[PDB]
């Protein structure tokens, strides 16, 4: 119910509510962004865990990949690590059981859970001293070509990180961000935002600067993907680092489509399948974006028509995201 990111950052006196919003987005993002101390601790614990892995396999190393090596992670989310000795393949599991047994014994984990992120077996736990959440696997879970797209998209796309964090937070407050239960995966979310940004009338024309317009773009993102996107008929891909729509009917690789209504995004490492196939709860996802649009827009009307005294210390984002 509190909106800590608002404290000492009131924009209630702003003329354009869509600026109010833009500024609040930046406040939240900075609030969810790490401190030097936070970083110090993270490195220590990671190193502590690496050191515990060396004990089983002195040849192995440990690297952070994913949300945490970009900065697209929500606080408290698992930080993903790969272990590097030739320990993967079919020996993957047997070796995870050993790492688990060992973590528990050395007190770097309490409850350890085995799970799977797309045929890649993963071990989730909490390092007790720091309370940090870790997920370990012997193989990166976000493809290879996909990962590279991410870093590149982040270079040539102002606003990408900010909108992704907001959308990520939104989806998470509702439990709409896990594939296990048919939510949107990480790459998929990044894709949607990226596409939207890169083919927005005011953006391809270089008329607008997203970083100065993330309020509207946020709303319009939920508007596009909540109210208008032809989920049944339109797919997403990339021809030459350029976001692209193509009709399902032309994607022959999958055209015996058992289920018409579902998100279709071209797998960067295999143009043969969509990585969004697993998001079976896409119906409720669309309902939720529309909800977000409704909430944001309604809120904007509500404030743009109230006394400045009633605006003091108010939050636009607060009720849409939860947190």
């Amino acid at each position: 119910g509190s909106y800590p990111w608002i404290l000492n950052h009131d924009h209630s006196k702003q003329k354009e509510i869509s600026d109010w919003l833009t500024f609040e987005i930046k406040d939240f993002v900075a609030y969810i962004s790490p401190s030097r101390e936070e970083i110090e601790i993270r490195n220590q614990t990671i190193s502590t865990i690496r050191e515990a892995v060396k004990q089983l396999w002195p040849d192995a190393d440990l690297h952070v990949f994913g949300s945490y090596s970009t900065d697209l992670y929500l606080p408290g989310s698992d930080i993903d690590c790969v272990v590097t000795s030739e320990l993967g393949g079919k020996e993957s599991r047997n070796n995870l059981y050993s790492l688990a047994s060992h973590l528990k014994k050395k007190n770097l984990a309490t409850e350890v859970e085995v799970v799977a992120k797309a045929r890649v077996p993963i071990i989730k736990f909490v390092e007790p001293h720091s309370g940090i959440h870790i997920a370990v696997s012997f193989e990166r879970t976000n493809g290879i070509e996909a990962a590279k797209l991410i870093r590149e998209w982040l270079d040539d796309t102002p606003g990408l990180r900010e909108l992704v964090l907001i959308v990520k937070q939104f989806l998470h407050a509702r439990r709409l961000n896990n594939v296990h239960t048919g939510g949107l995966g990480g790459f998929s979310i990044i894709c949607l935002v990226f596409s939207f940004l890169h083919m927005h009338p005011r953006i391809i024309t270089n008329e607008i600067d997203p970083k100065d317009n993330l309020g509207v773009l946020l709303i319009e993102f939920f508007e596009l993907y909540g109210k208008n996107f032809g989920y049944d008929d339109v797919a997403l891909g990339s021809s030459d680092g350029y976001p692209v729509y193509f009709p399902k009917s032309t994607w022959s690789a999958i055209q015996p489509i058992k289920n018409p209504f579902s998100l279709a995004i071209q797998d960067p490492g295999d143009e043969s399948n969509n990585i969004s196939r697993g998001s079976f709860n896409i119906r409720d996802i669309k309902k939720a974006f529309a909800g977000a649009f409704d909430l944001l827009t309604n809120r904007c009307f509500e404030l743009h028509s109230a006394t400045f005294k009633d605006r003091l210390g108010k939050s636009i984002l607060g009720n849409v995201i939860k947190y």
């Binding site: 600026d19 009338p201 509207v216 596009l224 996107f229 009307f301």
Partner: protein, 64 residues
């Protein structure tokens, strides 16, 4: 019915121009049919979203 928008699908107290404001300094794709050359908003086919929008989106050729 709005006097800012000139439209008659909502009141002034609900005109999208309230929140849809921009601060100013290849090919196009339609969200309705995966077709190129036009925006999904002003497209010719039956709409792929059973959800209405008698008032436009960001994605019309009006470049807004």
């Amino acid at each position: 019915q709005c006097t800012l928008c000139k439209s008659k699908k909502h009141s002034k107290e609900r005109c999208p121009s309230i929140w849809r404001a921009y601060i100013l300094v290849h090919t196009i794709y339609c969200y309705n049919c995966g077709g190129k050359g036009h925006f999904g908003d002003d497209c010719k086919e039956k709409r792929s979203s059973r959800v209405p929008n008698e008032d436009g989106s960001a994605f019309t050729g009006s470049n807004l």
